[model samples]
Target: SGPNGGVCPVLIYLCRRDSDCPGECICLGNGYCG
Candidate 1:
C-alpha cells in the first residue's frame, strides 16, 4: 500500500503550483490541478 492508504491515487498529470494550472483549474493538495 502507498501513502494516503491508497485513498488518493497518483494523478496522471499534476501541477507544482496553482499558477501552473489553468484559470479554471486549481491545484489540489494531492498536487493535481482540477
Candidate 2:
C-alpha cells in the first residue's frame, strides 16, 4: 500500500482477517481489489 491507502497494480480482495471480507463471494480482482 502507498501513503494514501493506495494499493498496488496487481491486487486481490481476499478474506484477509477472517470476517473482514464480509458476505460470501470469493476473491475478486482486476488491477486491484473490489
Candidate 3:
C-alpha cells in the first residue's frame, strides 16, 4: 500500500435548510458540502 498510506472514509453532508443542500454545493458558514 502506497499513495499517502491509504485509509479513508469520507461522507460530508451538512446543512440546515435550502433542502439541506446538494449539487455544486458549499456553504462555508461552518457547514455544507457536496
Candidate 4:
C-alpha cells in the first residue's frame, strides 16, 4: 500500500511523496514515481 494506505497505479510522472503515487508506488529523488 501507499502512504495514503491505498493502491497506486503505474505512473510515469513526477511525485513529491509516496502519497503522490498509487499502488505502492514511491517517489524517487528525480521527483518521479517508481
- lDDT assessment of candidate 3: 0.45
lDDT tens per residue, model 3, 6-26: 232244677664345554354
Name the lDDT value of residue 3 in candidate 3.
Answer: 30
lDDT minimum window of 10 residues, candidate 1: 1-10
What's model 3's lDDT at 30? 63
Superposed model 4: Cα runs more than 4 Å off: 1-10
Q: Local error of candidate 3 at 15, Å?
A: 5.7
Give Cα distance to truth, residue 27, candidate 4, Å: 0.5
Clashes of 1: 0
List model 2 lDDT by residue over 1-34, tens digit each. Answer: 3233433344455544423333333234332233
Query: What's the distance in Å from true for residue 1, model 3?
Result: 38
Error of 4 at 16 (Å): 0.7
Ranking by TM-score: 4, 1, 3, 2
Candidate 3 segments exceeding 4 Å error: 1-21
Off by over 4 Å in 2: 1-11, 14-16, 25-34
TM-score for each candidate, following the candidate numbering: 0.47, 0.19, 0.21, 0.56
User: How much is the lDDT of residue 11 in candidate 4?
Assistant: 57
- For each candidate, the alpha-carbon lDDT, in order, equals 0.55, 0.36, 0.45, 0.69
List the lowest-lDDT window of 10 residues for candidate 3: 1-10
Q: Which candidate wins on lDDT?
A: 4
